[PDB]
Design a binder for this molecule. Sequence first.
Ligand SMILES: *[C@H](c1[nH]c(/C=C2\NC(=O)C(CC)=C2C)c(C)c1CCC(=O)O)c1[nH]c(C[C@H]2NC(=O)C(C)=C2[C@@H](*)C)c(C)c1CCC(=O)O
Length: 165
Amino acid sequence: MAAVQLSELRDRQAIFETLVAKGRELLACDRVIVYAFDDNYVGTVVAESVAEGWPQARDQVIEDPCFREHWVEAYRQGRIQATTDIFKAGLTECHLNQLRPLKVRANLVVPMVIDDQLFGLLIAHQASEPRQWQEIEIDQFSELASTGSLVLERLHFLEQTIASL
Ligand SMILES: *[C@H](c1[nH]c(/C=C2\NC(=O)C(CC)=C2C)c(C)c1CCC(=O)O)c1[nH]c(C[C@H]2NC(=O)C(C)=C2[C@@H](*)C)c(C)c1CCC(=O)O
C-alpha cells in the first residue's frame, strides 16, 4: 500500500489513557469519564477509567443537549461547574435516572477548547461518595486537560503550518 509505517503516527487511544490515567492517579479519583465532542453535539467515550466494581463504558455516545447546547459558548470562555452532591443540582427526572444506574455522585466539568473549538470535555465523577474539588484541583485539571489539546492540535496540523519554525 504505502511505504510509510504507522509508527509515524501515534495511537489516539493511548494519549487519552494518559489524561484519564493521571487524573485518577494524581487526584486519586474513583471514576472519571472522558469523551470527545462531535459535529452533532454528541460526545464519544473513547477512553474511560473506573475502579473495580463500577460500570465501564468506552465506545458510548453521550447525548445531553442541555449544557453542551447552551453552555457551549460559556465553555468556550472556560467556564466550569462544580457540584458535590448532584442531589442538590439537577432536580430533573431522566437525569437522575440516567446517573442512578451509573451511581455517579458528583459533577466536575472542565472545558477543552482547541483552535477555539470545543473538541472534547473532561468530566470526573465519584462513584463511591460525593466529593469537593478544590480550586487548586481545577487548576491542575486545566493544565492536565490542556496538555491533551496540544497533542491533538499537533496531529490536526503539522504537514504545513510554519516552515520558518
Ligand atoms: C444538563 C446536563 N446534562 C449533563 C450531562 C451529564 N452529566 C453526567 O454526569 C453525565 C454522565 C455520567 C452526563 C451525560 C450535564 C453535565 C448537565 C449540566 C449540569 C447542571 O447544572 O444541570 C441537564 N440535563 C438534563 C436532563 C435531560 N437533558 C438532557 O440533555 C438529557 C439527555 C436528559 C435526560 C433524557 C437537564 C434537565 C439538564 C438541566 C437544564 C439546564 O439547566 O439547561
